[model samples]
Target: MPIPNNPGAGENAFDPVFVNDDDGYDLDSFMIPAHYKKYLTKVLVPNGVIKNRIEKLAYDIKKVYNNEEFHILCLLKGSRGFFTALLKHLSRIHNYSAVETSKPLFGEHYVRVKSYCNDQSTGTLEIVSEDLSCLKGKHVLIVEDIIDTGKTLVKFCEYLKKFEIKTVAIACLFIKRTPLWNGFKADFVGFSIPDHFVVGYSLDYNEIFRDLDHCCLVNDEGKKKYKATSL
Candidate 1:
């Protein structure tokens, strides 16, 4: 289905309830490396907020499949942490359900694709490696840490079509405003952020700041320090 242009249609759609709220978590209390702290402007999505959203995202995903089995394809590097959390919660919801079934509820797989250079996508995609044979003839959920320009996803989805999968869906932790998405939409989204460059909770900048507990804006200094030639 095409994503709603209004941004308020689905449970996973971006909501303003917590958009500007500061009651979620205490960003001041979170610890970070001394050098990296200066580049962090403010917490966009706190760790607690992300966890809560992931739980809901899993439930939403489960409802979509309705106890049927599905496969999760984690986009590598940035998605590792988000995929792990989603997998744990999804398993809990499926395993402890009142209904009984002989078939397993879910399976998992991984694929790596790279298109970003220093905080920006190169407008081209490269599949480092993918083993999608297991996903053939099955429902597949593509989990990503974030979606920016959407060029990579549009290309990736086209690639998945070659495998003859039964169905394809997308889930993402962050969705940045990008007019270039070209109508592609992630079925499950944790947060919708402005166009600012962000890092933390598996999002990175020149391979740094991924360890921070909360999503934060990368300041001018960090951007200058990590800038890369457009690829």
Candidate 2:
């Protein structure tokens, strides 16, 4: 019997407030805002679990770029929560010297880019906000919320080629093992989850659930209430 370097899942994943002994986190007993009880379902990945996972993932990323510099391209809106958390951990690791490294440099930039699926008849990619010129000739890492069809990110990587960075990498908070995912691999991945319309933790439906800390599944009821009417 030997102690392991790895930490146990969630420190009690099902229970958000604290670790559960043997009951194994009752989903029905899980509590969220009263307003959202009718809309959100059981917590798939709680903030506690996400935070724990983020710390470990940061370490993994640090190992890869221990003595080098890299630029982080944060996709706007959905990935903001993940981007913020990842930077905090990485900065702490660098400041505290938790992981020994000769040198580590990482700069961050934000981009709100998307492929317009609204009108598939005329295909177009848009970089609505932010700039990428500074990232030229630097190692660039793109942060994303989840990997869905994976086509948008693929196109984004191609778009980034104009800047001609030294290298590029992709990191995602979660990736669905769905058939539509395009089988594109990310350099760093926190979790591989089931296919679902995930919300909370910056993932939103109808601009709701952005404030929620836990990653949740929006029920049919939620969708029905918040469904976007075609504009």
Candidate 3:
């Protein structure tokens, strides 16, 4: 199957970092902090590009659920930045529409689910924090930072079903190019990346590089120091 493409994925959308190819744009094209520069083999997606794509996603989401109320459930840690960016843009759309329609745009919720340790999923998903009682009878949009094997997402979806939600949908910053993900599709996707071990832009190595502004490939030295077990 061809790689799934986001509407606003930008010029580098099909670059090797995203398409699993060996040759593509130069990594050094992206500017980064000196301290974290050596640890990044390539800058897969620049911060500006991410924000632009997310803005488009927000627009698309608003168009679909226009004038309707819904809830956004943000997965924690990794999704912190993505959730904030998406919400900011989405809220802007709501603000603009509310002026004319006099209708409320949406609501927001937060939850944390953990299933990975040292870059590898433990195959057990744990909802560390949530109060979803308010979501009863509401349309829910699951905001995620990325989708790899999709195990955690599937597990989370199953868990949400017990709450009697009116509906469930997904939005994600990144989705790996793999056939293993089954039974779910993100309604909003920022990018489709190759199966590379990436860090930065809220993705991390033992919580080290999350502060970096760009999505980046983790270099061998950084991987070694961080004790990453996943490829």
Candidate 4:
């Protein structure tokens, strides 16, 4: 593979970083489906950059548990791409011989969770979650999408504690480094991003642009084009 390495992955307590608007790649570098025009600005994180970082994240976690098993907890929907990519790399450093990649890599428990009311986030809120008692006493690795308010994820972590699962380690593929960032530290971080509201690779605006191969910034024009009609 002719993939170039980049400064996309990291761990430990790191200061938030910034990437200037002009620093982002020109959109013409990668191909996108028609109709993805002016709605997008620049490529904040390319596909190849993500792959290179995830491979290192796999290595970082492996050093902690040589052979001990841990069940990976996918933070639903958005992280489908992130979760699967991580699993593939984790399967590589198997202690014993394994028949296939799936056999060696410990697998899934999607924490499908959401809070809502009669409309959207009304004053009245209710949390709907999936069954997770199976994770009791098992080490858990949580894979997440971009962390924005940090409220949703922070609440989820606290909720997981009620089940008394062994551990809750988080791995985030992308995080917005905005002034309002709640200072939530993920155990593994793939990209230290600028304060650019973005979409691609499962991150979306009205659920559009997930099919995009690169993490891209969304301009105001695109938002108006695909905005939901109803409240």
Candidate 5:
């Protein structure tokens, strides 16, 4: 994806896969403060921090399914880890009940998981489902990586509505703590992070940084060297 023409350069600098240059910038200098790490550890871990948070979320979702009968619609690419963790805990508790449900894909039993790839340069959202036939009349829970402008999610919901599917809820792994969103809310959110650029644990910049164990903020020098238009 090409960097937007008017983007803040610092946001693009730490990309491991350079769109314009081949240089790899060292990221240790801009390590997030210990206080931030402490906060994330509190909300990101399995317990005492995130502590059974995924299970609680899955329980809520299971209740939704038991009552409203909705399918889980996961966004591809970004939500991979979140879905993995959430599913692992969800499976442990539900056991057989989880097996009885189904995904939207034909011949696949589980909740419906789907994704949309955005063309950053053109601002276009493309759905990547092989079978659109399965979306009709089903209740859906749209799982997302994050919600910023709300355009992509809104577009996704509109697409499902076009297929006559009922949207049960929206679940996001993280939500930005900004005043931009007024009344919008997520049905299930793993954490609420301050409005800042971050990458790691399946999050990426120019398709890099997804392998980082913990999330981080990019340094200014790192940003200046790499955050340019793709060659």
Candidate 6:
């Protein structure tokens, strides 16, 4: 598939978007780093495993929330792509139309997206106003790019507990191998990736590499030395 439109591209030639080291393996395509791509293929590419898992998750969510109203709390900076893809496929299978004389349950169903970010200095999370008071008494599906440390997710869950939410389900595109994250597992997970820092499909580091369509981990040399800063 052609690359998705790049909102981050600039006029300057020096500007560079980060490339995931695992892109080639995931997509089963050429034009990616040759050496690591081949070796990563066995474990990385699994014949639409991620896509099927996400589709099932969407259906599961639809079944759980069919009777009630709910909202999708998308973790900003990483979860955008996952949410977009899920929404597209989910809507195809089950659109939120109410009062259909021909269909099963007849009631309007809706979902809203909310985002949150953390401050570096204070370590406190700031919820976007769109996500502010709207979550109370509504079902919540927490979407995330990946779960590694689980600290940030823990914080968000604790914050959501303050509200009168009917139910909370955590969904993630990927999960890194970490013992701490095992206990706090996501209700729906797209892929279980080994413990490695990755970027792509909206995951980024130092504000670059979020544009890649597939997941990738840097090679040993590149992974060790690479560091980026915010724009």
Clash count of each predicted structure: 0, 0, 0, 0, 6, 2
Better of 2 and 4 by lDDT: 2
- Judged by whole-model lDDT over C-alpha atoms, candidate 6 comes out at 0.54
Off by over 4 Å in 1: 1-29, 98-102, 229-231
TM-score of each: 0.85, 0.80, 0.85, 0.82, 0.63, 0.66
Please give the RMSD to the true structure for each candidate, in Å: 4.1, 7.9, 5.9, 6.5, 12.2, 12.1
lDDT of each: 0.76, 0.70, 0.75, 0.69, 0.49, 0.54
Q: List the residue pairs that clash in candidate 4.
A: none
Worst 10 residues of 1 by lDDT: 1-10
- List the lowest-lDDT window of 10 residues for candidate 4: 1-10
Mind giving the per-residue lDDT tens digits that candidate 3 earns over 1-231? 112222122212222124444522456686788888777788777788888888888887787777777888889878988999988999888886676637777788888788777767888998974668788998787889988888878788878877888877777888887666554557667887877777877887778889988888888888777784553
Task: Compare candidates 4 and 5 on lDDT and give the better one.
Answer: 4
TM-score-best of 3 and 6 = 3
Candidate 4 differs from the real structure by a C-alpha RMSD in angstroms, to one decimal, of 6.5
| Candidate 6 local lDDT, 115-176, one digit each (tens) | 22221112444555443456666656677877666666666677666666666667677766
TM-score of 5: 0.63
* lDDT (Cα, 0-100) at 44 in candidate 4: 84
lDDT tens digits, residue span 1-231, model 1: 332222122334444223543322334767666778778777777777788889998887777776677888899889987998999998888778846545677788888888888876778898975567777788878899987777777888888877888877788888777565555567788887777788988889888888887888888988988777556
Worst 10 residues of 6 by lDDT: 2-11
